């Protein structure tokens, strides 16, 4: 069961996929490859729920039908250096203009 | 070679003429039309005798009883009607088909009527009572023609399913099917005067004479156009032995029965000639045409 994710921090969004059977630690390894921060310097989140490294993505509630290619689920990422922990902060995307009259 | 020449044109109908038949006694021509009417005409002078009415929709066919006293008509209204020709009176309305009735005929004894329908059935009717005695539904597409053999013991039917079937009248059971190759839709069939053969038309511009018992085809007549309409065909036996048919190119074709040569093409009609009839004793042909013509023509020859 593949799951499709956006890993999000500040104004960075990584599109990636993994298995429902994948672990949170394996997700951090993906992140490490891209952002060059080891897993121990990374905290992952579903909404405001911190995610445990040993849990599977399915165990966290990332399912094939809540994490679809065309509608991926959001994982929040916040970094950590020693005893300093950065807060989870995800800058929202822009918004579309008012719907034009002819489209209502 | 015959020399049919036009004697009369009959312009009573206001729509396509579907069928013309001569009375067995030679006196009368009946015509049927998409205009819901049957008309009776003098066979020798083309003089209008009467209109017979009552069908609620177009009429596809008419047929005479052996003593020329009765007509049966087959209508888009899903009924047949038995008529007394002298009165114009509907004696019986035959109800039972569930779609257009296309063809009809009495048996020689004239106690029975046979019919075929778009509903893919052949029915046998009691003339006295007007009750359906049997339904024969083996065909798998519309029935185009139905005919009794010379003693009434068999019926032949033709279908768009590409078969002719021979039925035992007494039992209702099918004795034989003629499936020739490709089986284009069959548009007409009847028994030869001698009862041994069947003349069949297919919508591939072909007429065939069949020895039905042996399932072998003796003759083929071509040169005409027949790919859409169910055009009647005849055996002409009063002078030379000919096959007579209409055509979608608006001509009456006449073939030598034996040689299969076209001996004459009758020019005159302005639409498909859907029906032709041969007078029982004289060398007279009636032809009838579709919507752009709406006329009957009477032709006469020395042989």
């Amino acid at each position: 069961m593949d799951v499709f994710l956006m890993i999000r921090r500040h104004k960075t969004t990584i599109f990636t996929d993994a298995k429902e059977s994948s672990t949170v630690f394996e997700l951090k390894r993906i992140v490490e490859g891209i952002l060059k921060r080891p897993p121990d310097e990374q905290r992952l989140y579903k909404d405001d729920q911190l995610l445990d490294d040993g849990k599977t993505l399915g165990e966290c509630g990332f399912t094939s039908q809540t994490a679809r290619p065309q509608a991926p689920a959001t994982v929040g990422l916040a970094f950590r250096a020693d005893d300093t922990f950065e807060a989870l902060c995800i800058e929202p995307f822009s918004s579309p203009p008012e719907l034009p009259d002819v489209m209502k | 070679s015959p020399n049919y020449a036009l004697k009369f044109t009959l312009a009573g109908h206001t729509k396509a003429v579907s069928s013309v038949k001569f009375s067995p006694n030679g006196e009368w021509l009946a015509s049927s039309s998409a205009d819901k009417l049957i008309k009776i005409w003098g066979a020798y002078d083309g003089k209008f005798e009467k209109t017979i009415s009552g069908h609620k929709l177009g009429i596809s066919d008419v047929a005479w009883s052996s003593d020329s006293n009765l007509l049966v008509s087959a209508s888009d209204d899903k009924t047949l009607k038995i008529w007394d020709v002298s009165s114009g009176k509907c004696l019986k309305t035959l109800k039972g088909h569930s779609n257009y009735v296309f063809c009809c005929n009495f048996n020689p004894q004239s106690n029975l009527i046979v019919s075929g329908s778009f509903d893919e059935s052949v029915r046998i009717w009691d003339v006295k009572t007007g009750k359906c005695l049997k339904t024969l539904p083996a065909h798998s597409d519309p029935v185009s023609a139905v005919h009794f053999n010379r003693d009434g013991s068999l019926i032949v039917s033709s279908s768009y399913d590409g078969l002719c079937r021979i039925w035992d009248t007494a039992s209702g059971q099918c004795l034989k099917t003629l499936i020739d190759d490709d089986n284009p839709p069959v548009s007409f069939v009847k028994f030869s005067p001698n009862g041994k053969y069947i003349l069949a038309a297919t919508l591939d511009n072909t007429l065939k004479l069949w020895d039905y018992s042996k399932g072998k085809c003796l003759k083929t007549y071509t040169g005409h156009k027949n790919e859409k309409y169910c055009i009647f065909a005849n055996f002409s036996v009063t002078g030379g032995k000919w096959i007579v048919s209409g055509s979608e190119d608006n001509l009456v074709y006449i073939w030598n029965l034996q040689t299969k040569e076209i001996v004459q093409k009758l020019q005159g009609h302005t639409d498909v000639v859907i029906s032709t009839a041969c007078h029982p004793t004289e060398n007279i042909i009636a032809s009838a045409a579709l919507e752009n013509d709406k006329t009957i023509k009477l032709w006469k020859s020395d042989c």
Binding site: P100, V102, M103 | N183
Partner: protein, 150 residues
Amino acid sequence: RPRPVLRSVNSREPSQVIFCNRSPRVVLPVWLNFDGEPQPYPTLPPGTGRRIHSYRGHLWLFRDAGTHDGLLVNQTELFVPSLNVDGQPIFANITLPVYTLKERCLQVVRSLVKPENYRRLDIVRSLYEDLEDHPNVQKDLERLTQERIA
């Protein structure tokens, strides 16, 4: 008489087929008759299947019933029934193609904007023309016979 290559053959040999709508669209089955003229059949709601009587060598395609978007059947554009083997019907699995983003966006704007209003849209003119080039069977048969030549 010359006829289009894309037409059913009158084989008169029966084939039982399951039309299986594996699409979120209301599906229009389209049978190409013996002249190559398209004939519309009864529609299938999303999530439905019907067992139907067809014939060997007959030719089908499937569209969105409301918009005439083209759909696939067994991963291709055209479906030809063959002879049933061993009492089993032939499945015709009707699915969405993977549309281009552009085509998908055109589908959606077409569904929102009446044709006479396309040109009130604040977009380049080439897109007005794209919006107006509505999918249809006529157009695809052309393409499919053009493709067929290679």
